Scaffold this motif. Structure first.
Motif, PDB file in Angstrom:
ATOM      1  N   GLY A  60      16.987   1.305  -9.981  1.00 50.22           N
ATOM      2  CA  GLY A  60      16.561   1.977 -11.201  1.00 50.22           C
ATOM      3  C   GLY A  60      15.611   3.143 -10.980  1.00 50.22           C
ATOM      4  O   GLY A  60      15.281   3.868 -11.913  1.00 50.22           O
ATOM      5  N   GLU A  61      15.177   3.334  -9.738  1.00 48.27           N
ATOM      6  CA  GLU A  61      14.108   4.284  -9.428  1.00 48.27           C
ATOM      7  C   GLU A  61      14.624   5.676  -9.097  1.00 48.27           C
ATOM      8  O   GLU A  61      13.839   6.573  -8.775  1.00 48.27           O
ATOM      9  N   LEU A  62      15.941   5.861  -9.145  1.00 46.57           N
ATOM     10  CA  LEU A  62      16.510   7.164  -8.830  1.00 46.57           C
ATOM     11  C   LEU A  62      17.621   7.557  -9.802  1.00 46.57           C
ATOM     12  O   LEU A  62      18.421   6.724 -10.231  1.00 46.57           O
ATOM     13  N   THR A  63      17.664   8.838 -10.133  1.00 50.61           N
ATOM     14  CA  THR A  63      18.568   9.323 -11.155  1.00 50.61           C
ATOM     15  C   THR A  63      19.342  10.542 -10.686  1.00 50.61           C
ATOM     16  O   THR A  63      20.479  10.757 -11.109  1.00 50.61           O
ATOM     17  N   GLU A  64      18.736  11.325  -9.797  1.00 48.86           N
ATOM     18  CA  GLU A  64      19.381  12.502  -9.221  1.00 48.86           C
ATOM     19  C   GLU A  64      19.358  12.381  -7.705  1.00 48.86           C
ATOM     20  O   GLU A  64      18.315  12.072  -7.123  1.00 48.86           O
ATOM     21  N   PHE A  65      20.507  12.594  -7.065  1.00 45.98           N
ATOM     22  CA  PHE A  65      20.579  12.600  -5.604  1.00 45.98           C
ATOM     23  C   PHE A  65      20.248  13.960  -4.997  1.00 45.98           C
ATOM     24  O   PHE A  65      20.543  15.004  -5.569  1.00 45.98           O
ATOM     25  N   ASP A  66      19.620  13.922  -3.828  1.00 44.63           N
ATOM     26  CA  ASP A  66      19.430  15.104  -3.005  1.00 44.63           C
ATOM     27  C   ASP A  66      20.004  14.734  -1.645  1.00 44.63           C
ATOM     28  O   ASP A  66      19.287  14.227  -0.785  1.00 44.63           O
ATOM     29  N   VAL A  67      21.316  14.928  -1.483  1.00 43.98           N
ATOM     30  CA  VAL A  67      22.020  14.611  -0.236  1.00 43.98           C
ATOM     31  C   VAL A  67      22.988  15.747   0.132  1.00 43.98           C
ATOM     32  O   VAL A  67      23.589  16.365  -0.742  1.00 43.98           O
ATOM     33  N   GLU A  68      23.113  16.037   1.428  1.00 45.22           N
ATOM     34  CA  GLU A  68      24.035  17.060   1.920  1.00 45.22           C
ATOM     35  C   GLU A  68      25.468  16.535   1.948  1.00 45.22           C
ATOM     36  O   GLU A  68      25.741  15.537   2.606  1.00 45.22           O
ATOM     37  N   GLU A 151      27.013  -0.108 -16.327  1.00 46.82           N
ATOM     38  CA  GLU A 151      26.031  -0.986 -16.967  1.00 46.82           C
ATOM     39  C   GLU A 151      24.620  -0.701 -16.440  1.00 46.82           C
ATOM     40  O   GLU A 151      23.647  -0.702 -17.198  1.00 46.82           O
ATOM     41  N   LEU A 152      24.511  -0.448 -15.143  1.00 42.48           N
ATOM     42  CA  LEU A 152      23.219  -0.107 -14.557  1.00 42.48           C
ATOM     43  C   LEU A 152      22.633   1.157 -15.194  1.00 42.48           C
ATOM     44  O   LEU A 152      21.474   1.185 -15.608  1.00 42.48           O
ATOM     45  N   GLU A 153      23.438   2.211 -15.264  1.00 47.32           N
ATOM     46  CA  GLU A 153      22.970   3.479 -15.795  1.00 47.32           C
ATOM     47  C   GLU A 153      22.637   3.389 -17.284  1.00 47.32           C
ATOM     48  O   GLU A 153      21.773   4.107 -17.774  1.00 47.32           O
ATOM     49  N   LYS A 154      23.312   2.498 -18.004  1.00 47.14           N
ATOM     50  CA  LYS A 154      23.053   2.377 -19.438  1.00 47.14           C
ATOM     51  C   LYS A 154      21.750   1.624 -19.713  1.00 47.14           C
ATOM     52  O   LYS A 154      21.122   1.815 -20.751  1.00 47.14           O
ATOM     53  N   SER A 155      21.341   0.783 -18.769  1.00 49.46           N
ATOM     54  CA  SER A 155      20.169  -0.078 -18.939  1.00 49.46           C
ATOM     55  C   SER A 155      18.848   0.635 -18.675  1.00 49.46           C
ATOM     56  O   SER A 155      17.788   0.037 -18.788  1.00 49.46           O
ATOM     57  N   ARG A 156      18.931   1.901 -18.297  1.00 51.99           N
ATOM     58  CA  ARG A 156      17.779   2.744 -17.975  1.00 51.99           C
ATOM     59  C   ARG A 156      16.687   2.706 -19.041  1.00 51.99           C
ATOM     60  O   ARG A 156      16.911   3.079 -20.187  1.00 51.99           O
ATOM     61  N   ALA A 157      15.499   2.264 -18.647  1.00 50.80           N
ATOM     62  CA  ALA A 157      14.349   2.250 -19.540  1.00 50.80           C
ATOM     63  C   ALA A 157      13.795   3.656 -19.721  1.00 50.80           C
ATOM     64  O   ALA A 157      13.925   4.501 -18.834  1.00 50.80           O
ATOM     65  N   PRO A 158      13.177   3.914 -20.880  1.00 55.21           N
ATOM     66  CA  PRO A 158      12.472   5.176 -21.134  1.00 55.21           C
ATOM     67  C   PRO A 158      11.635   5.625 -19.932  1.00 55.21           C
ATOM     68  O   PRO A 158      11.077   4.798 -19.198  1.00 55.21           O
ATOM     69  N   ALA A 159      11.577   6.940 -19.736  1.00 54.91           N
ATOM     70  CA  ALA A 159      10.995   7.524 -18.532  1.00 54.91           C
ATOM     71  C   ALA A 159       9.471   7.466 -18.523  1.00 54.91           C
ATOM     72  O   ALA A 159       8.846   7.559 -17.470  1.00 54.91           O
ATOM     73  N   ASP A 160       8.876   7.303 -19.696  1.00 53.76           N
ATOM     74  CA  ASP A 160       7.437   7.403 -19.813  1.00 53.76           C
ATOM     75  C   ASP A 160       6.994   6.629 -21.044  1.00 53.76           C
ATOM     76  O   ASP A 160       7.075   7.134 -22.168  1.00 53.76           O
ATOM     77  N   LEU A 161       6.530   5.400 -20.832  1.00 53.93           N
ATOM     78  CA  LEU A 161       6.068   4.570 -21.939  1.00 53.93           C
ATOM     79  C   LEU A 161       4.877   5.211 -22.652  1.00 53.93           C
ATOM     80  O   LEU A 161       4.596   4.874 -23.800  1.00 53.93           O
ATOM     81  N   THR A 162       4.184   6.152 -21.997  1.00 55.04           N
ATOM     82  CA  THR A 162       3.005   6.754 -22.625  1.00 55.04           C
ATOM     83  C   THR A 162       3.414   7.564 -23.837  1.00 55.04           C
ATOM     84  O   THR A 162       2.588   7.848 -24.706  1.00 55.04           O
TER      85      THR A 162
END
Length: 165
Positions: A60-68, A151-162
């Motif tokens: 859950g800690e990654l959303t965009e890849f930086d890979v060659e 299902e994993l990608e849909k379960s994504r919690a809000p990015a900033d509870l603040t």
């Protein structure tokens, strides 16, 4: 020349392969016939970054890849895979939408076929494309892998509870 590394994952052992730090392949290769793999050198420490990012993705800690990446396929496949890369995490597109995007209106079924040949799964997100009737496709457990990722990608919690206070 190509080396490879396999890691555990919620969707099965993922084989990463390629040359240097550049990925050419990423697939759950088990229980399938893959004759290329016999020509490949194992390297338990190759693609250090991609493995970390994959692990982070599943956590859950990654959303965009930086890979060659080095994608090999036909002109039409490349256009499709390029468009796949424009689909954000947690979103989907239809095959028809993708055919429109690459300049080939009406080519939904061709996109479906090309999508099936995607050499680098997850990072090039072939799982985010679904037909109008909503049915997943893919032999060899492919349907269930796709569903897991969706299902994993849909379960994504809000990015900033603040932002709620």
């Amino acid at each position: 020349m190509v080396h490879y590394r396999t890691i555990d994952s919620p969707i099965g052992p993922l084989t990463l392969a390629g040359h240097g730090s550049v990925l050419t392949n990423l697939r759950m290769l088990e229980q399938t016939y893959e004759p290329s793999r016999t020509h490949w050198t194992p390297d338990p420490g190759a693609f250090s970054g991609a493995v970390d990012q994959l692990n982070a993705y599943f956590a859950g800690e990654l959303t965009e890849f930086d890979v060659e990446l080095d994608l090999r396929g036909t002109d039409f496949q490349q256009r499709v895979w390029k468009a796949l890369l424009t689909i954000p995490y947690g979103e989907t597109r239809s095959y028809g939408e993708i055919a429109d995007q690459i300049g080939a209106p009406g080519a939904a079924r061709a996109v479906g076929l090309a999508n099936g040949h995607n050499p680098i799964a997850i990072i090039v997100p072939c799982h985010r494309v679904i037909g109008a009737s909503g049915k997943l496709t893919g032999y060899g457990g492919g349907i269930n892998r796709k569903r897991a990722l969706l299902e994993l990608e849909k379960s994504r919690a809000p990015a900033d509870l603040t932002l709620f206070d």
